[PDB]
């Protein structure tokens with residue numbers, strides 16, 4: 188466990204600093220993220236969701252330490268296609284939204300040992316990558332809703348946070 | 352007489368929401384922005400720098416108010432060339448650095464009464480437009496610098512903010 | 516006594532300054548005061564008559580981080596080339612800028628903070644600052660390249676401003 | 681009244697005249713009068729504490745070939761030459777000043793009409809001297825720092841003496 192920030196929260200809206208150096212401290216943040224992610228049954232997690240304002244993403248679609256991706260200072264280089272599934276967020280518990288995404292994405296990033304890599308993804312991986320990168324730029328799925336819908340979500344989550 | 356946010360500040364790193372409605376309130380904000388820009392002797396200003404997280408930019412290169420530019424929900428249509436000047440920012444006081452920029456730019460935006468316009472710009476104007484639209488995506492000139500230089504500026508400004 | 520600056524209009528902003536006879540420590544103290552004034556007011560260049568010292572002294576730091584402080588005492592342009600322009604501002608003329616026709620590259624000889632002679636090639640902003648500050652040493656401001664009308668308008672705003680501050 | 685070096689107004693770059701009106705023409709006439717009373721062949725407004733670009737020259741001394749230069753500017757100039765130049769604002773001193781021998785100068789006359797003049801010899805020299813004044817430059821500024829200092833100090837003590 189680290190603490191998962193719930194919307195609304197300023198650090199869920201912040202564009203994160205790139206990692207300067209992928210070292211031991213960073214790799215502990217990565218392992219701690221994986222833990223929290225699995226504990227919460229997430230298929231991805233972005234650093235700011237646990238109050239760390241750095242560009243670090245952990246992903247595991249199938250959720251069994253199989254295809255574990257670490258994406259540090261990631262950038263989408265190319266994309267194509269159109270898709271959109273109903274997305275939920277650990278930082279926005281209890282809500283879903285159809286989010287228009289690119290079907291296919293090609294991404295560059297540093298792995299947990301600091302080595303650059305480039306990855307082509309589609310389907311769920313591609314969507315999860317995009318959901319996670321929005322996080323790094325302080326964008327949530329609610330940001331694709333109407334200001335009115337988003338507001339109503341917000342009010343409800345405020346309640347849930349005093350309640351918890 | 353609105354106050355300018357000083358780096359580091361979470362709200363200087365926020366992607367701002369589109370203005371949905373260019374109404375009297377947005378116009379009041381515009382006039383307040385110009386006042387602050389003039390008071391603080393800037394040539395441009397983005398709404399987040401006065402802590403208003405919407406896509407509103409005010410520019411006046413000469414400062415005599417003859418050629419005021421209001422850019423609401425701006426989008427760069429196209430750009431080319433290269434330049435850079437050691438750029439300063441009211442939100443990063445005392446520091447300047449060369450930023451790689453396009454030399455010439457064409458933006459579309461809404462004016463003060465919500466009428467669409469297109470503007471072609473070069474020279475300083477073009478540079479300011481890019482810098483100000485960068486603020487709207489939660490990007491500052493120090494984010495183009497080495498993390499080392501960015502860090503020094505951050506440290507020296509946290510000091511200065513305490514003094515204030 | 517505060518790190519303040521003469522504001523246009525003022526006679527001493529149009530005075531032609533005399534060469535420093537010797538770079539002693541009244542002068543080095545003027546240099547350090549100028550830098551502090553530049554930094555206080557978030558400027559990139561300064562000339563001595565802007566803090567009311569009628570001497571040929573200029574301090575420049577384009578980046579603000581002190582990593583590249585230039586000091587130029589009794590400067591002279593050996594040569595220059597090309598032309599350029601950027602809407603220039605001045606701490607002595609707050610809230611205004613105007614494009615001023617400048618040389619793009621410039622070669623300047625001057626004395627450093629210790630009194631030792633250097634030569635500097637400069638382009639870009641640096642070269643524009645050098646020229647702008649040398650103009651100050653010769654009782655010339657950016658408003659003097661404008662039209663009587665534009666300048667008179669600026670003067671009028673600035674009197675008003677000076678009062679209110 | 682003629683200012684005596686040192687004085688900040690003898691170092692001030694003067695403002696252009698915007699209208700050649702009657703205030704200006706009185707200035708011009710008051711300047712010739714002062715120039716002749718004090719035995720000069722050239723005078724510049726700041727020498728009489730008027731910070732505007734106005735020059736009054738008479739090399740002859742006879743009110744015959746009087747030149748008036750308002751908002752002058754040099755367009756061309758060739759050759760080198762020199763003379764032991766004095767200045768009514770710097771009484772009791774002269775210095776050899778390297779000048780252009782020939783000068784081309786465009787200015788407004790006494791009634792604000794534009795004219796352009798080629799000049800040589802003494803005229804040319806005074807024109808340069810007198811434009812220097814409008815740009816805050818005195819003949820002593822062509823001297824070594826210590827020599828300038830020396831004269832400034834004597835004239836400071838001379839100034840008190842009256």
Ligand SMILES: CCCCC[C@H](CC(=O)NO)C(=O)N[C@H](C(=O)N1CCC[C@H]1CO)C(C)C
Pocket residue numbers: 227228229230231232233236273274275276277278314315318319322
């Ligand atoms: C779809 C794009 C990736 C979503 C990532 C999120 C984790 C998160 O909030 N990242 O910022 C998640 O796992 N959400 C879960 C989720 O929505 N899941 C889990 C299995 C399938 C998928 C349904 O969208 C929740 C509801 C447990």
Ligand SMILES: CCCCC[C@H](CC(=O)NO)C(=O)N[C@H](C(=O)N1CCC[C@H]1CO)C(C)C
Pocket residue numbers: 392393394395396397400436437438439440441442443447478479482483486557640
């Ligand atoms: C430089 C491109 C435009 C930057 C805009 C800034 C104002 C700002 O903080 N905008 O977000 C500005 O006015 N900058 C000034 C500035 O530093 N300038 C003015 C000319 C270019 C640049 C420094 O070279 C400051 C000191 C008032």
Ligand SMILES: CCCCC[C@H](CC(=O)NO)C(=O)N[C@H](C(=O)N1CCC[C@H]1CO)C(C)C
Pocket residue numbers: 392475557558559560561562565601602603604605606607608612640643644645647648651
């Ligand atoms: C750049 C030419 C040299 C001017 C330097 C001045 C400081 C000054 O008054 N020097 O005499 C400055 O810092 N000017 C700034 C300024 O306006 N700049 C920065 C770069 C160009 C110009 C405006 O575009 C101000 C507003 C802080």
Ligand SMILES: CCCCC[C@H](CC(=O)NO)C(=O)N[C@H](C(=O)N1CCC[C@H]1CO)C(C)C
Pocket residue numbers: 718719720721722723724727764765766767768769770771772805806809810813
């Ligand atoms: C030639 C340069 C113009 C100098 C004219 C000066 C008058 C002056 O003060 N001009 O600014 C003059 O006549 N000065 C006299 C003088 O000494 N002479 C003799 C004629 C001109 C000058 C020598 O240049 C006085 C002091 C007696």
Ligand code: NI
Pocket residue numbers: 275276277278318322
């Ligand atoms: Ni999420």
Ligand code: NI
Pocket residue numbers: 439440441442482483486
């Ligand atoms: Ni800025």
Ligand code: NI
Pocket residue numbers: 604605606607647651
């Ligand atoms: Ni200046």
Ligand code: NI
Pocket residue numbers: 766767768769809813
């Ligand atoms: Ni004279």
